[PDB]
Structure formats: structure tokens, C-alpha cells
Design a protein around this motif. Structure first.
Motif, PDB file in Angstrom:
ATOM      1  N   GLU A  23      35.141 178.376  25.592  1.00 18.86           N
ATOM      2  CA  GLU A  23      36.322 178.932  26.524  1.00 18.86           C
ATOM      3  C   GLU A  23      36.601 177.955  27.536  1.00 18.86           C
ATOM      4  N   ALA A  24      35.464 177.561  28.584  1.00 19.95           N
ATOM      5  CA  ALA A  24      36.063 176.190  28.861  1.00 19.95           C
ATOM      6  C   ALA A  24      36.018 175.220  29.376  1.00 19.95           C
ATOM      7  N   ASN A  75      39.856 174.820  28.722  1.00 21.54           N
ATOM      8  CA  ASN A  75      40.752 174.756  30.141  1.00 21.54           C
ATOM      9  C   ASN A  75      39.896 173.833  31.658  1.00 21.54           C
ATOM     10  N   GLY A  76      39.486 172.603  30.648  1.00 18.52           N
ATOM     11  CA  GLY A  76      38.793 172.044  30.785  1.00 18.52           C
ATOM     12  C   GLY A  76      37.896 172.284  32.151  1.00 18.52           C
ATOM     13  N   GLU A  77      37.957 172.944  32.186  1.00 20.51           N
ATOM     14  CA  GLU A  77      36.561 173.707  33.319  1.00 20.51           C
ATOM     15  C   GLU A  77      35.462 173.123  33.072  1.00 20.51           C
ATOM     16  N   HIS A  78      34.501 173.335  34.229  1.00 21.64           N
ATOM     17  CA  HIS A  78      33.126 173.086  34.276  1.00 21.64           C
ATOM     18  C   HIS A  78      32.754 172.206  32.938  1.00 21.64           C
ATOM     19  N   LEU A  79      33.134 171.384  32.759  1.00 24.15           N
ATOM     20  CA  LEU A  79      33.041 169.969  32.127  1.00 24.15           C
ATOM     21  C   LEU A  79      31.308 169.357  32.557  1.00 24.15           C
ATOM     22  N   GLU A  80      31.372 169.381  33.865  1.00 20.61           N
ATOM     23  CA  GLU A  80      29.367 168.747  34.857  1.00 20.61           C
ATOM     24  C   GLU A  80      29.769 169.480  33.820  1.00 20.61           C
ATOM     25  N   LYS A  81      29.022 170.350  33.987  1.00 23.00           N
ATOM     26  CA  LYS A  81      28.504 172.053  34.189  1.00 23.00           C
ATOM     27  C   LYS A  81      27.948 171.517  32.501  1.00 23.00           C
ATOM     28  N   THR A 110      42.119 170.480  23.165  1.00 22.63           N
ATOM     29  CA  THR A 110      41.243 170.786  23.932  1.00 22.63           C
ATOM     30  C   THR A 110      40.106 170.664  24.283  1.00 22.63           C
ATOM     31  N   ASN A 119      37.592 167.372  25.083  1.00 23.46           N
ATOM     32  CA  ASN A 119      36.601 167.537  26.174  1.00 23.46           C
ATOM     33  C   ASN A 119      35.457 167.572  25.542  1.00 23.46           C
TER      34      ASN A 119
END
Length: 239
Positions: free
Chosen positions: A4-5, A8-14, A39, A43
Motif C-alpha cells: 500500500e506504501a 502511494n509512492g511512500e516510504h520508498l527508500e525505506k 503505481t 515503484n
């Protein structure tokens, strides 16, 4: 939640750092390449591809999966990301690109507009990433023009219809070889030679008047070709 991250393009580096250290995450991202959400696919690619620069074994499986994804992608950012990934293997794994591109063209259906466009973007990115690889790959296909087998010429021809502005100077020296197939005895090959010549004329104004003139001049036995000549005569005149 990894999936789910990605959406939404979140936490990618994580996610990248986790995937890079825990194999079971790496495998998860690979599996999420099949998700219906673009998406997510997008990603996942960009993460796996950074991890690939330090893990050589990711390239080959990923290239195969990219081939399927260019068949599947409808979202232009995904298309773009696919094409950039092709560009990155062209600089880092040139031989792998060299040895698999003929595989794609020989194996995959590339005769609907959507696919055609998706595939063009990737070869334009291979062409800007490694000019030398590109000329070299063009030569492998232009060898397939002489082949006896019907399929192998249509594979060369499919390749030539996915050529673009940046690979055009590689095929330009092969013209006569391509025009040569207008004298092929198999009607289906003649018509595809026409489509392919039609498509190259749209990349260059000089070649466009050569082709025009040529296709007018032509009178054929196949209807399946005469139609092809006439439609394509119609497109080129516009420009």
C-alpha cells in the motif's frame, strides 16, 4: 504495509533498504510486479532496479518480466519506467540486452498500437543509453532480412516498425536490404515490408518522398498487398 506504501509512492527508500537486506522483501517486491495497480508495479521496478546494480542476478529475470509488462502496461508513467529500466540494462548489461531483444521480437505479439508504442519507448531508451549497443542490435536484425524463414523476416520487420528518431541513423544504411523484400515471393512479407518502409518514411522527409514514389510505381498481384500500398500511400502524402 509494503504494497500500500508502493501504491502511494511512500516510504520508498525505506522499502528499498529493507528489500536490500531481507531477501524475503526483495521476493515480495518481485511478486508485486504482477499487481494490477500500476503505481505499485512502477515503484517496485524502480526499487528492484536500484538493488540490481549490486546484484547481477536480478537483471535477467527482470528483463523477461519487463517484456511481459510492456505487453500489459496502459499507464504512461509505468511505460516510462519500463523504458528507463531498459536504458539502465543497456549501460550495465549490454550483452544481456543484445541477446534478449531478438527474443522479444521473435516471440511476442507486437502488432497493436498500444504494444508498438510501449516497445518503441524502450528501444529509444536503449538507443540513447548505448549507441554502440544499438547499432549492434540493429545489425543482428538486418541479418534476419536475408533469412529463408518467413517468421524471421517478419521479426526483422516488426523491429524496424519499432525504430525511432534516435535509432533511425542505424537503419538508414540498410534501406536497400529492406526495399529488397518488396521483391519477396511471399505476399505477406511484401506487405510487411511496405508497412515497415511506411513507418521509416515518417521519421525522415527525404526517405518519405523516396518511399512515396516507390509505392505509387508498384502494382501487385496480392490484394492483401495493394491495399497496404494504398493505405500507406495515403498516410505519407499528409506529411
Amino acid at each position: 504495509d509494503i504494497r500500500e506504501a508502493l501504491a502511494n509512492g511512500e516510504h520508498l527508500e525505506k522499502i528499498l533498504i529493507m528489500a536490500k537486506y531481507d531477501e524475503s522483501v526483495l521476493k515480495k517486491l518481485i511478486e508485486l510486479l504482477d499487481d494490477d495497480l500500476w503505481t505499485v508495479v512502477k515503484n517496485a521496478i524502480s526499487i528492484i532496479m536500484v538493488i540490481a546494480k549490486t546484484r547481477e542476478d536480478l537483471y535477467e529475470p527482470m528483463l523477461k518480466k519487463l517484456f511481459s509488462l510492456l505487453k500489459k502496461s496502459e499507464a504512461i508513467p509505468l511505460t516510462q519506467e519500463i523504458a528507463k529500466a531498459f536504458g539502465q540494462m543497456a549501460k550495465e548489461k549490454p550483452e544481456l540486452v543484445k541477446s534478449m531483444i531478438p527474443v522479444l521480437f521473435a516471440n511476442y505479439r507486437i502488432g497493436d498500437e498500444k504494444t508498438k508504442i510501449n516497445v518503441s519507448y524502450a528501444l529509444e531508451e536503449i538507443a540513447k543509453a548505448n549507441p554502440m549497443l544499438m547499432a549492434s542490435i540493429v545489425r543482428d536484425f538486418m541479418s534476419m532480412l536475408s533469412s529463408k524463414n518467413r517468421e524471421d523476416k517478419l521479426t526483422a520487420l516488426n523491429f524496424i516498425e519499432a525504430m525511432g528518431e534516435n535509432s533511425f541513423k542505424y537503419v538508414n544504411p540498410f534501406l536497400p536490404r529492406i526495399i529488397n523484400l518488396l521483391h519477396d515471393g511471399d505476399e505477406i512479407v511484401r506487405a510487411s515490408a511496405v508497412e515497415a518502409l511506411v513507418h521509416l518514411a515518417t521519421l525522415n522527409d527525404k526517405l518519405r518522398k523516396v518511399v512515396i514514389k516507390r509505392l505509387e510505381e508498384l502494382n501487385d498481384t496480392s490484394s492483401l498487398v495493394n491495399k497496404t500500398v494504398k493505405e500507406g500511400i495515403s498516410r505519407l502524402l499528409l506529411l
